[PDB]
RNA sequence: CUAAGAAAUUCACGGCGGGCUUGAUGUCCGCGUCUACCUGGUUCACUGCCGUGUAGGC
């Protein structure tokens, strides 16, 4: 979309900054979730997919201007400190066929052992011995800290950039979950 | 090529007993331990679509 706000954050020493990029996910989610607009694009530049680091930049698509001053707001409400926002620019278009989206993964064996025996395969022990073993725990790089709202613990979030092969534009969802789930224009 | 050249000390045994170390004593006075400080990077869970497996929500 047209209408991105690159956000870069201001160098803080008492305060880590991937503990600070979860406050803002957390704050763009309720205040994304209040809002009447379904589809608002979200994107990490700076990605760094080597050392296994989440950027220090972030940017919004949002086809429309009162939404995006509305978003311009939402990511900053209460904070006016730590964000250190930019201005609505006019995109380029190279769009590199980017997407991004949610994963995730299973790596506590008990609640599948709880979901197996309290709700289809009633039984007391045989679930302990079929499926899990202390093996094929997995993980996934980018982590979120994402403290819950409606009655949640801490719980992490996990988010991939598709292939970037440079042959076609196909068209996507916007946004698919909180912040993202479909392509969006790459720089 | 040596004050050279050689060589069986061998046997036995009862050290015994007796005894009052005694009393006496004033260690004793003094004292300033001060000063400063980010445990923090770090609660991958609960429960469900689902016969596995692998999609999703917060």
Known sequence: MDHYLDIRLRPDPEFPPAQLMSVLFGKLHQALVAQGG??????????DESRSRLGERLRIHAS???????????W?????????????AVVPHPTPYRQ????????????????????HD????????????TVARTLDLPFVTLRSQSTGQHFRLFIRHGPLQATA?????????????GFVPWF
């Open 38 to 47: 379904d589809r608002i694009g979200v994107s990490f530049p700076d990605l």
């Open 64 to 74: 429309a201007d009162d939404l995006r001053a509305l978003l311009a707001r939402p």
């Open 76 to 88: 900053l409400e209460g904070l006016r400190d730590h964000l250190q926002f930019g201005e609505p």
């Open 100 to 119: 991004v989206s949610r994963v995730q993964a299973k790596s506590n064996p008990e609640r599948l052992r709880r979901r197996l025996m309290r709700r």
């Open 122 to 133: 009633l039984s007391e022990e045989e679930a302990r011995k079929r499926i899990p073993d």
């Open 169 to 181: 534009e196909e068209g996507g969802f916007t946004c698919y979950g909180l912040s993202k789930g």
